[PDB]
Amino acid sequence: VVSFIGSTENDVGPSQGSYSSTHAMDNLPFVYNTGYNIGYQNANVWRIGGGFCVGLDGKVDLPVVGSLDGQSIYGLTEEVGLLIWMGDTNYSRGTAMSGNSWENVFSGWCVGNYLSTQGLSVHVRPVILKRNSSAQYSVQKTSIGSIRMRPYNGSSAGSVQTTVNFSLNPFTLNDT
Ligand SMILES: CC(=O)N[C@@H]1[C@@H](O)[C@H](O)[C@@H](CO)O[C@H]1O
């Protein structure tokens, strides 16, 4: 048994967020290490039971303005980009992202003959692209991508909602 209990649209990171870094941005691109603060986590998006086996798929829509260490830097504005992560519940369980096609983000599992729940989590890292002349970057609310449950081992979804989508909450990058 499965069931959708979460929400279709989920905002990544809080609104009006301010971030700072005194590290080093000499040789762009630079990537703020804000940990997992800009993201989304709902360990309860699908209710499952009876051997139901589920995995997790993710897909970012933003264009690939490049690639950082085998990961795809996704762009928003001329000067701003991001390192995107998607996967299962525990933020630490994230799977970096490359391209704009559906990729496996969580190997999944097979619950027992009891009632549990299936979750997901997104986390992003703000990348600075092209130079500026104010040392300040704005970020307007923009779509990012989605996650879709992956029923396997003979498991079925049916008409039960399989995908939820994400959106990047606005914010601004500082540095000083
Ligand atoms: C904490 C909880 O009760 N629900 C978790 C769910 O968030 C997670 O997606 C799934 C697979 O790891 O395992 C469930 O037990």
Q: Which residues are bridge partners to 156 per DSSP? A: none
If 0-12 CB within 10 Å is exposed, 13-18 middle and 19+ buried, where does residue 164 land?
A: buried
| Nearest partner of 121 among 97, 95, 100, 83, judged by Cα | 95
- 149 Cβ neighbours under 8 A, 6+ residues apart: 2, 45, 46, 54, 55, 56, 57, 118, 157, 162, 163
Residue 116 Cβ contacting ligand 1 at under 6 Å: yes
The total number of residues written for the chain in this structure: 176
Whole-angstrom CA distances from 168 to 25, 34, 122, 130 are 23, 15, 10, 20
Among positive and negative, which fits the CA dihedral 134, 176, 36, 100? positive
Q: Is 158 annotated as a binding residue?
A: no
Q: What is the CATH number of the domain that holds 13?
A: 2.60.40.1410
Match 């799977």 to its residue by tokens. 95
Contact 119, 43 (CB under 8 A): yes
Strand-strand pairing, 53-60 and 103-110: antiparallel
> Resolution in A for the shown PDB structure?
2.2
Letter for the amino acid at 165? Answer: N
- Exposure pattern of 117-140 as b/e (b: 16+ CB <10 Å)? bbbbbbbbbbbbbeebeeeebebe
Q: Is 89 annotated as a binding residue?
A: yes
Atom number, ligand 1, closest to the C-alpha of residue 54: 11
Ligand 1 site-directed mutation target among 47, 110, 116, most atoms within 8 Å of CB = 116
Alpha carbon nearest to ligand 1 atom 13, residue = 118
Q: Which two tokens stand for residue 122?
A: 């997104």
Give the number of domains in the chain.
1
How large is the C-alpha radius of gyration of the chain?
Answer: 17
Phi-psi region of 16 (alpha: psi -120 to 50; beta: other; left: phi over 0): left
Contact 85, 103 (CB under 8 A): no
Q: Which domain holds residue 126?
A: 1-176
